[PDB]
Write a protein that binds this ligand. Structure first.
Ligand SMILES: CN(CCOc1ccc(C[C@H](Nc2ccccc2C(=O)c2ccccc2)C(=O)O)cc1)c1ccccn1
Lengths: 15, 271
Protein backbone atom coordinates (compact mmCIF):
# COMPACT_ATOMS: atom_id res chain seq x y z
CA UNK A 1 0.00 0.00 0.00
CA UNK A 2 0.92 3.56 0.88
CA UNK A 3 2.06 5.77 3.75
CA UNK A 4 -1.62 5.18 4.62
CA UNK A 5 -1.08 1.48 5.37
CA UNK A 6 2.55 1.34 6.59
CA UNK A 7 3.08 3.09 9.94
CA UNK A 8 6.04 0.82 10.77
CA UNK A 9 7.92 1.30 7.49
CA UNK A 10 7.38 5.06 7.73
CA UNK A 11 8.68 4.92 11.31
CA UNK A 12 11.76 3.04 10.11
CA UNK A 13 12.05 5.54 7.26
CA UNK A 14 12.10 8.78 9.24
CA UNK A 15 15.44 10.16 10.45
CA UNK B 1 31.95 10.40 -14.81
CA UNK B 2 33.96 7.20 -14.42
CA UNK B 3 35.43 8.67 -11.23
CA UNK B 4 31.97 9.63 -9.98
CA UNK B 5 30.62 6.12 -10.61
CA UNK B 6 33.55 4.74 -8.59
CA UNK B 7 32.93 7.23 -5.77
CA UNK B 8 29.29 6.11 -5.67
CA UNK B 9 30.40 2.48 -5.28
CA UNK B 10 32.61 3.40 -2.31
CA UNK B 11 29.71 5.30 -0.73
CA UNK B 12 27.51 2.23 -1.05
CA UNK B 13 30.13 -0.23 0.22
CA UNK B 14 30.77 1.97 3.25
CA UNK B 15 27.05 2.29 3.96
CA UNK B 16 26.74 -1.46 3.54
CA UNK B 17 29.50 -1.99 6.08
CA UNK B 18 27.85 0.28 8.62
CA UNK B 19 24.47 -1.35 8.05
CA UNK B 20 25.04 -5.15 7.98
CA UNK B 21 26.98 -6.61 10.94
CA UNK B 22 27.61 -10.05 9.31
CA UNK B 23 29.09 -9.42 5.87
CA UNK B 24 29.84 -11.99 3.20
CA UNK B 25 33.53 -11.48 3.98
CA UNK B 26 33.05 -12.47 7.63
CA UNK B 27 30.58 -15.25 6.81
CA UNK B 28 32.95 -16.80 4.28
CA UNK B 29 35.76 -16.81 6.87
CA UNK B 30 33.47 -18.67 9.28
CA UNK B 31 32.22 -21.16 6.71
CA UNK B 32 35.76 -22.10 5.71
CA UNK B 33 37.31 -22.34 9.16
CA UNK B 34 39.58 -19.36 8.46
CA UNK B 35 38.55 -17.52 11.67
CA UNK B 36 40.02 -17.78 15.17
CA UNK B 37 36.47 -17.75 16.58
CA UNK B 38 35.57 -21.22 17.75
CA UNK B 39 33.31 -22.86 15.18
CA UNK B 40 29.56 -22.11 15.18
CA UNK B 41 27.45 -24.64 16.99
CA UNK B 42 25.95 -27.07 14.47
CA UNK B 43 22.23 -27.82 14.62
CA UNK B 44 21.68 -30.97 12.53
CA UNK B 45 18.92 -32.98 14.24
CA UNK B 46 16.28 -32.59 16.91
CA UNK B 47 18.72 -33.22 19.79
CA UNK B 48 21.33 -30.77 18.67
CA UNK B 49 18.61 -28.14 18.11
CA UNK B 50 17.62 -28.44 21.79
CA UNK B 51 21.29 -28.47 22.77
CA UNK B 52 22.12 -25.29 20.81
CA UNK B 53 18.73 -23.56 21.04
CA UNK B 54 19.96 -20.92 23.55
CA UNK B 55 22.32 -19.77 20.80
CA UNK B 56 19.52 -18.65 18.48
CA UNK B 57 18.98 -14.92 19.09
CA UNK B 58 15.46 -14.61 20.47
CA UNK B 59 14.02 -12.13 22.98
CA UNK B 60 10.44 -12.63 24.18
CA UNK B 61 8.23 -13.20 27.21
CA UNK B 62 9.73 -16.71 27.62
CA UNK B 63 12.78 -18.43 26.14
CA UNK B 64 12.53 -19.89 22.63
CA UNK B 65 12.56 -23.39 24.24
CA UNK B 66 9.11 -22.82 25.75
CA UNK B 67 7.56 -21.17 22.66
CA UNK B 68 5.88 -24.37 21.41
CA UNK B 69 5.84 -28.10 21.91
CA UNK B 70 6.95 -28.43 18.27
CA UNK B 71 10.55 -27.98 17.22
CA UNK B 72 9.36 -26.73 13.82
CA UNK B 73 7.25 -23.98 15.39
CA UNK B 74 10.29 -22.84 17.38
CA UNK B 75 12.40 -22.72 14.22
CA UNK B 76 9.65 -20.62 12.67
CA UNK B 77 9.65 -18.23 15.63
CA UNK B 78 13.43 -18.00 15.61
CA UNK B 79 13.65 -17.17 11.94
CA UNK B 80 10.87 -14.60 12.21
CA UNK B 81 12.80 -12.86 14.99
CA UNK B 82 15.81 -12.55 12.65
CA UNK B 83 13.68 -11.31 9.71
CA UNK B 84 12.46 -8.28 11.69
CA UNK B 85 16.05 -7.30 12.48
CA UNK B 86 17.01 -7.92 8.83
CA UNK B 87 14.28 -5.51 7.66
CA UNK B 88 15.68 -2.86 10.00
CA UNK B 89 19.20 -3.22 8.57
CA UNK B 90 17.94 -3.03 4.96
CA UNK B 91 16.00 0.17 5.78
CA UNK B 92 19.08 1.87 7.27
CA UNK B 93 21.04 0.93 4.13
CA UNK B 94 18.26 2.16 1.83
CA UNK B 95 18.41 5.59 3.44
CA UNK B 96 22.06 5.96 2.42
CA UNK B 97 21.23 5.34 -1.23
CA UNK B 98 21.78 8.76 -2.83
CA UNK B 99 18.48 10.21 -3.96
CA UNK B 100 16.39 7.72 -2.00
CA UNK B 101 15.46 10.05 0.89
CA UNK B 102 14.69 12.88 -1.56
CA UNK B 103 11.91 10.78 -3.14
CA UNK B 104 8.21 10.97 -2.39
CA UNK B 105 7.85 9.23 0.97
CA UNK B 106 4.93 7.22 -0.47
CA UNK B 107 7.28 5.75 -3.08
CA UNK B 108 9.99 5.18 -0.43
CA UNK B 109 7.51 3.01 1.46
CA UNK B 110 6.57 1.08 -1.70
CA UNK B 111 10.19 0.36 -2.69
CA UNK B 112 10.99 -0.92 0.82
CA UNK B 113 7.79 -3.00 0.87
CA UNK B 114 8.55 -4.84 -2.35
CA UNK B 115 12.29 -4.96 -2.21
CA UNK B 116 13.11 -6.05 1.40
CA UNK B 117 12.48 -9.75 1.00
CA UNK B 118 14.35 -9.83 -2.30
CA UNK B 119 17.35 -8.37 -0.50
CA UNK B 120 16.95 -10.76 2.43
CA UNK B 121 17.22 -13.70 0.02
CA UNK B 122 20.12 -12.13 -1.81
CA UNK B 123 22.14 -11.64 1.41
CA UNK B 124 21.02 -14.96 2.85
CA UNK B 125 23.09 -16.64 0.13
CA UNK B 126 26.15 -15.00 1.70
CA UNK B 127 25.44 -17.09 4.84
CA UNK B 128 24.98 -20.40 3.03
CA UNK B 129 27.01 -23.20 1.60
CA UNK B 130 25.49 -26.24 -0.04
CA UNK B 131 25.10 -28.01 3.34
CA UNK B 132 23.60 -25.29 5.57
CA UNK B 133 23.17 -21.72 6.79
CA UNK B 134 24.77 -19.52 9.48
CA UNK B 135 22.34 -18.21 12.08
CA UNK B 136 22.53 -15.68 14.92
CA UNK B 137 25.41 -13.69 13.48
CA UNK B 138 27.57 -16.71 12.85
CA UNK B 139 27.18 -18.28 16.28
CA UNK B 140 25.26 -21.25 14.93
CA UNK B 141 25.05 -23.22 11.69
CA UNK B 142 21.83 -25.02 10.85
CA UNK B 143 22.05 -27.82 8.31
CA UNK B 144 20.10 -28.02 5.07
CA UNK B 145 19.27 -31.66 5.80
CA UNK B 146 17.77 -30.70 9.17
CA UNK B 147 15.69 -27.85 7.75
CA UNK B 148 14.40 -30.17 5.02
CA UNK B 149 13.18 -32.73 7.59
CA UNK B 150 10.87 -30.42 9.50
CA UNK B 151 7.27 -31.56 9.17
CA UNK B 152 5.42 -30.05 6.22
CA UNK B 153 5.08 -27.16 5.39
CA UNK B 154 7.97 -26.07 7.64
CA UNK B 155 10.31 -28.39 5.79
CA UNK B 156 9.65 -26.63 2.47
CA UNK B 157 10.71 -23.06 3.34
CA UNK B 158 14.49 -23.10 3.17
CA UNK B 159 15.23 -25.60 0.36
CA UNK B 160 14.45 -23.15 -2.53
CA UNK B 161 16.67 -20.55 -0.82
CA UNK B 162 19.51 -23.03 -0.63
CA UNK B 163 18.86 -23.95 -4.29
CA UNK B 164 19.09 -20.30 -5.31
CA UNK B 165 22.18 -19.58 -3.17
CA UNK B 166 24.34 -22.38 -4.60
CA UNK B 167 23.72 -20.98 -8.07
CA UNK B 168 24.04 -17.39 -6.91
CA UNK B 169 27.22 -18.05 -4.91
CA UNK B 170 28.77 -19.54 -8.04
CA UNK B 171 28.92 -15.95 -9.29
CA UNK B 172 31.47 -15.34 -6.46
CA UNK B 173 30.33 -11.76 -5.80
CA UNK B 174 31.96 -9.89 -2.91
CA UNK B 175 30.49 -7.36 -0.45
CA UNK B 176 31.49 -4.44 -2.66
CA UNK B 177 29.56 -5.89 -5.62
CA UNK B 178 26.62 -6.79 -3.41
CA UNK B 179 26.25 -3.28 -2.02
CA UNK B 180 25.48 -1.89 -5.49
CA UNK B 181 23.34 -4.86 -6.50
CA UNK B 182 21.00 -4.59 -3.54
CA UNK B 183 20.71 -0.89 -4.31
CA UNK B 184 19.69 -1.68 -7.88
CA UNK B 185 17.06 -4.08 -6.47
CA UNK B 186 15.55 -1.49 -4.12
CA UNK B 187 15.20 1.18 -6.83
CA UNK B 188 13.00 -0.97 -9.08
CA UNK B 189 10.72 1.20 -11.21
CA UNK B 190 8.12 -1.50 -11.90
CA UNK B 191 6.93 -1.93 -8.31
CA UNK B 192 3.11 -1.86 -8.36
CA UNK B 193 1.82 1.40 -6.93
CA UNK B 194 4.70 3.80 -7.53
CA UNK B 195 3.44 7.37 -7.89
CA UNK B 196 6.45 9.07 -9.56
CA UNK B 197 8.31 6.39 -11.52
CA UNK B 198 10.85 8.63 -13.23
CA UNK B 199 13.36 9.77 -10.52
CA UNK B 200 13.38 6.17 -9.30
CA UNK B 201 14.21 4.79 -12.74
CA UNK B 202 16.76 7.59 -13.14
CA UNK B 203 18.51 6.57 -9.92
CA UNK B 204 18.41 2.88 -10.83
CA UNK B 205 19.90 3.42 -14.28
CA UNK B 206 22.80 5.25 -12.62
CA UNK B 207 23.20 2.46 -10.05
CA UNK B 208 23.32 -0.03 -12.93
CA UNK B 209 26.07 1.95 -14.65
CA UNK B 210 28.00 1.93 -11.34
CA UNK B 211 27.38 -1.81 -11.04
CA UNK B 212 28.62 -2.45 -14.57
CA UNK B 213 31.85 -0.55 -13.94
CA UNK B 214 32.13 -2.31 -10.58
CA UNK B 215 31.86 -5.83 -12.03
CA UNK B 216 34.20 -4.94 -14.87
CA UNK B 217 37.02 -3.79 -12.62
CA UNK B 218 36.46 -6.30 -9.85
CA UNK B 219 35.85 -9.33 -12.12
CA UNK B 220 37.64 -8.99 -15.43
CA UNK B 221 37.85 -12.48 -16.95
CA UNK B 222 34.26 -13.32 -15.86
CA UNK B 223 32.64 -12.77 -19.25
CA UNK B 224 29.10 -11.37 -19.12
CA UNK B 225 28.94 -11.42 -15.31
CA UNK B 226 26.71 -8.34 -15.41
CA UNK B 227 24.23 -10.21 -17.63
CA UNK B 228 24.28 -13.29 -15.41
CA UNK B 229 23.61 -11.16 -12.36
CA UNK B 230 20.66 -9.24 -13.81
CA UNK B 231 18.93 -12.59 -14.51
CA UNK B 232 18.96 -13.41 -10.74
CA UNK B 233 16.81 -10.32 -10.03
CA UNK B 234 13.85 -12.12 -11.55
CA UNK B 235 14.74 -15.30 -9.62
CA UNK B 236 14.35 -13.28 -6.40
CA UNK B 237 10.75 -12.54 -7.38
CA UNK B 238 9.78 -16.19 -7.86
CA UNK B 239 11.35 -17.03 -4.51
CA UNK B 240 9.18 -14.35 -2.90
CA UNK B 241 6.10 -15.63 -4.78
CA UNK B 242 6.57 -19.19 -3.55
CA UNK B 243 7.52 -18.06 -0.02
CA UNK B 244 4.31 -16.02 0.23
CA UNK B 245 2.38 -19.12 -0.82
CA UNK B 246 4.00 -21.18 1.97
CA UNK B 247 3.21 -18.54 4.60
CA UNK B 248 -0.39 -18.73 3.40
CA UNK B 249 -0.38 -22.45 4.13
CA UNK B 250 0.79 -21.68 7.67
CA UNK B 251 -1.87 -19.08 8.49
CA UNK B 252 -4.54 -21.34 6.97
CA UNK B 253 -3.50 -24.69 8.52
CA UNK B 254 -1.61 -23.98 11.78
CA UNK B 255 -3.49 -22.64 14.80
CA UNK B 256 -2.54 -19.10 15.93
CA UNK B 257 0.43 -18.28 13.73
CA UNK B 258 0.05 -14.54 13.35
CA UNK B 259 3.18 -12.94 11.98
CA UNK B 260 5.13 -10.18 13.67
CA UNK B 261 3.28 -6.89 12.98
CA UNK B 262 6.08 -5.53 10.81
CA UNK B 263 6.02 -8.57 8.56
CA UNK B 264 2.24 -8.38 8.49
CA UNK B 265 2.56 -4.78 7.28
CA UNK B 266 4.97 -5.86 4.51
CA UNK B 267 2.86 -8.75 3.19
CA UNK B 268 -0.49 -6.93 3.45
CA UNK B 269 -1.60 -6.37 -0.18
CA UNK B 270 1.73 -7.47 -1.67
CA UNK B 271 0.81 -8.33 -5.30
C1 LIG C 1 17.44 -20.10 8.46
N1 LIG C 1 17.75 -19.02 9.39
C2 LIG C 1 18.57 -17.87 9.00
C3 LIG C 1 17.57 -16.72 8.61
O1 LIG C 1 16.88 -17.18 7.43
C4 LIG C 1 15.79 -16.44 6.96
C5 LIG C 1 14.96 -17.01 6.01
C6 LIG C 1 13.86 -16.27 5.54
C7 LIG C 1 13.65 -14.98 6.02
C8 LIG C 1 12.44 -14.17 5.52
C9 LIG C 1 11.28 -14.40 6.49
N2 LIG C 1 10.84 -15.79 6.53
C10 LIG C 1 10.08 -16.22 7.74
C11 LIG C 1 9.36 -15.24 8.46
C12 LIG C 1 8.66 -15.64 9.60
C13 LIG C 1 8.69 -16.97 10.04
C14 LIG C 1 9.41 -17.95 9.36
C15 LIG C 1 10.11 -17.56 8.22
C16 LIG C 1 10.90 -18.64 7.45
O2 LIG C 1 11.56 -18.29 6.54
C17 LIG C 1 10.92 -20.13 7.83
C18 LIG C 1 9.77 -20.86 8.00
C19 LIG C 1 9.84 -22.20 8.34
C20 LIG C 1 11.05 -22.83 8.49
C21 LIG C 1 12.20 -22.10 8.32
C22 LIG C 1 12.13 -20.76 7.96
C23 LIG C 1 10.07 -13.55 6.06
O3 LIG C 1 9.11 -14.09 5.50
O4 LIG C 1 10.05 -12.35 6.30
C24 LIG C 1 14.49 -14.40 6.95
C25 LIG C 1 15.57 -15.14 7.43
C26 LIG C 1 17.30 -19.05 10.75
C27 LIG C 1 16.42 -20.01 11.14
C28 LIG C 1 16.03 -20.01 12.47
C29 LIG C 1 16.56 -19.03 13.29
C30 LIG C 1 17.45 -18.07 12.83
N3 LIG C 1 17.77 -18.12 11.56
Amino acid sequence: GNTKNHPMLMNLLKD
Amino acid sequence: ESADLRALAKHLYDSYIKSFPLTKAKARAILTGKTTDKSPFVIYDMNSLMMGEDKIKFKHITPLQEQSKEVAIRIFQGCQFRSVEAVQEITEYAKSIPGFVNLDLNDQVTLLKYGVHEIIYTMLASLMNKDGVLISEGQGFMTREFLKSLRKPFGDFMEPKFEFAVKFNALELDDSDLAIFIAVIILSGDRPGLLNVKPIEDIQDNLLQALELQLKLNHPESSQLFAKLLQKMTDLRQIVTEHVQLLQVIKKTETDMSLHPLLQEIYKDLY
